[PDB]
Amino acid sequence: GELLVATARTQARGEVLEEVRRRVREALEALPQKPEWPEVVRKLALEALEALPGAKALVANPE
Amino acid sequence: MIQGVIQKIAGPAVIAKGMLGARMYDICKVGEEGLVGEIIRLDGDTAFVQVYEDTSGLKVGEPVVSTGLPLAVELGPGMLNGIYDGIQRPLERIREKTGIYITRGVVVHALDREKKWAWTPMVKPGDEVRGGMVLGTVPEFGFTHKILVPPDVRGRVKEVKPAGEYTVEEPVVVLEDGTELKMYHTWPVRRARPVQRKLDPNTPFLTGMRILDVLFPVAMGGTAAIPGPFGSGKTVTQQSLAKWSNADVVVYVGCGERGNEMTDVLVEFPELTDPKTGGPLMHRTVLIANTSNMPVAAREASIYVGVTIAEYFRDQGFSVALMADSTSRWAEALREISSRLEEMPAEEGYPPYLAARLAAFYERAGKVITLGGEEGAVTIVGAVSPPGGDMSEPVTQSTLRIVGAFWRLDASLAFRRHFPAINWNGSYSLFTSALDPWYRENVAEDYPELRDAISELLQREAGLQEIVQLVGPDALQDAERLVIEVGRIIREDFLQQNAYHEVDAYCSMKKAYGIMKMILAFYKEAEAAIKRGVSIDEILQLPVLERIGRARYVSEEEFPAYFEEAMKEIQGAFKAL
Amino acid sequence: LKKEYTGITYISGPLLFVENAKDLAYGAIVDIKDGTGRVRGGQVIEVSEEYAVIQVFEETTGLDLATTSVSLVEDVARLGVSKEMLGRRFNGIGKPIDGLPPITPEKRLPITGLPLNPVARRKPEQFIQTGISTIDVMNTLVRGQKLPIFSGSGLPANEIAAQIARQATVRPDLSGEGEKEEPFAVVFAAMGITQRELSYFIQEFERTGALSRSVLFLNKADDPTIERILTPRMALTVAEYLAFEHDYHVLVILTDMTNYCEALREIGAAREEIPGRRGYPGYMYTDLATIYERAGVVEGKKGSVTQIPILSMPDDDRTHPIPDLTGYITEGQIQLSRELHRKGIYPPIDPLPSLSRLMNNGVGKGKTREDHKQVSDQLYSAYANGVDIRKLVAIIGEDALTENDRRYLQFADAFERFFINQGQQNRSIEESLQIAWALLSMLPQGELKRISKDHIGKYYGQK
């Protein structure tokens, strides 16, 4: 019964971290609806062409 | 379409350049006659291609046309009562197409595209089918062949064909996705068929042979391996296994073994009769046969085609036994193509992925709850032939680490005509403890303690054999010579079993429980009468030892009368002192 | 921020070469994304300036040169470890295989181990009861010791593995009184097992209640061989974490070291190099010392790691290199025998070739009980000259022995079926010793020549 308590508790600790992962998922999925979306897209593309010597082409969205 | 040209031809090995984009383990048609090959070891733009037929007269510059799918079998109705080559083409259709010789380049299909099966559906329109659910039913030789959804197909039924005569290929169920399901489907032979659950085994595999199904049993979902020297009694053992076991269907893989001992199975099986039902015996065996001088790359294909056919009939719900012999000939086939590849060999010349593939094959057995929801089982009996008659090989000591139930044939017991030639001292089985409750249920109540008494009598004999070869049967006492004689009469009249007498080629465990109980009763009251003081030499001449000796020859129908009679007489022979 | 090296050439069997990879460290783990999208694992061997080599874990089937790409992950192999993982099963790599969610790793550790410092290693001093009486009396496992179990083939080494797993405890009663709390753990590395042995283990642990203090690293035989090489590294680093940072006494059970060495031989042949004696690789001794010498008590640390590897000798010789090098690093062996197993005796240890090189500094006064080493010596010599009298009486006849040899005959034959034929019961150490004195009391006093006077005065005369 102690092992039953601890397995219910770890199955309960899993769902907290999963709903946190869902919040951050929908957060950076709805992230185009924020005015700093252009700065962050600019920024990470700058980091992509940054950390790769001899970088030639970029691929992105038309948006 | 990775159509390219041959660069180099050597043996059964064709390096074709001009093939960028072809994947590993793909079917290729090499040459103008469409010789089947498989891509391994691909680099640059080239591709090393092994060929399952013989290159002789190929020329460089012939075209290699890849197909883009791995080695795939066709699974469905019409494979029982069948014989196939390494890549599943029926040999009798070839014999009706070509002469009595296997000519290369021939293409036939693995099933009959004309024979009209009698469909009866079990799905209404609108049902929800997942993978492995049955669609309907086809009668086949008295089996009830249950047509499955392929294991990767999910949706809802748009339409169902009504019952009646059909060929194989007509669309019997069309899903709402546009996906149409025929009576058969392909499957890649290297990928294990999906499964819902692995059980644990609690039902034996009744071979028929007394020593196998008593002293070293093997459960229904169990691997089991049988090595032995040449001329030791492997192939006769596996023919008796395939002739008498209590399995539903039996897949016999002759992987690199001689042809007269496959024509034996073709000629003297249909005169026989399946013991469980009333069909002839040849209606329950699929027979895959790549012999010796048929080409050398197809042995790998033979082992995989056999195991994936067995997995199909497991998924239907049957209980399949697979007797695959000479896995070391498949290991040799791997050695020859790694010679052509100039890979580096492991010990003895075998390539390093040998044991990985032997594990990937023997783990495909084992008493599952299928995707369909009903249970089934594949049991594998693999014959292992050492290249020196030693069990210190890569094949043998890689196959004894992944199996239980290791039945080890020897040669001294084969040099004297003592069959089956099971070396008792080096054979074992790990399926005893789990088959305790089944034996206590369905054989007798005191069956395991009885058998462990047989085991300890044979152990005490093998302990005393040291002393008796170091002095003689001179200077053994009264008790220890009795242990010698009882161990000898077990070895001659319980374990020894010819497979040519009509009675005593199958031997049910009522009969084997009887013979063990006769020898234990004889032994027990003989040692009681030997402390009470007689000479052993007139115990060893009683008229009851011949009747225990002939106990094995009498019929399974008139046996319990014979058992009651000989138990009365074995009680009554010693009270006369 | 991944970085897919596409542009690969030459897939061959297990290997594949990547064109331009000067970023992968030697010994990295990599994702091999197929054309369709199934991800495989691989380990980077042989990085060079013009290509890098990847050994793919699993089968190579869907791979071609156009649509195939590798990607780095965790450039030296780490294990994400917590204290929480004491109810969990894992598969070589360290991913949960029981449906419970992944652990939150409070540390990440490199799975190759740093070697201990012999100045900072105190000596093994106290015992650990196993319940099995022929171990706990005649060759005691002490804490900080590695002692293997030399199985045969057909012998039930897995069952005695599970029995020591669910039955071993320390016992803080019979020391100097030592804070009963003293938590305990069993790390259980089964490498190269069947499916049948796996279902056996995950039923044998779940039925008792002894999965709530163990951890199981199981991989089947049809899993990748390089995962099987990584497995005892994983188990020993979890165990070494637990015992030297949370004061646990850990027992580690390494099942099937033969299957480890066979996987090591096949990966060493895949590495394109040349073997050594009898086909096994040259560095086999160092590669077994790397995973046996990660056990032992430490000066200052309260914890302790004890290590039972269970290995099947190939064709029943101790001159094979697997039991040769294992018994040449480890301390003693206990050895199963087919003879007692065929007579039907469980567990079939015979104590004549068995030995613990470290019992003598683990038992005795204050640690377990006063008479322990003397009882063990007397049992050994009395059974040892009972055996040859048994072998003698098959030609002499039972009459022509004396009274004294006859008493040794009855000693041997009641020994091997009351003291050894335990069944599946748990014999704590004093039940083992009272059966020991009841077995010795079929001999007269003063025949017991090794035991000193007081113990013969006090414990003799039972049963």
Ligand SMILES: Nc1ncnc2c1ncn2[C@@H]1O[C@H](COP(=O)(O)OP(=O)(O)O)[C@@H](O)[C@H]1O
């Ligand atoms: N159960 C048996 N009953 C009668 N004869 C047997 C039996 N088992 C083996 N033999 C004999 O042993 C010989 C060995 O045959 P086979 O199995 O082909 O040898 P191998 O071990 O090379 O396959 C056969 O000629 C057969 O006569």
Ligand SMILES: [Mg+2]
């Ligand atoms: Mg043969």
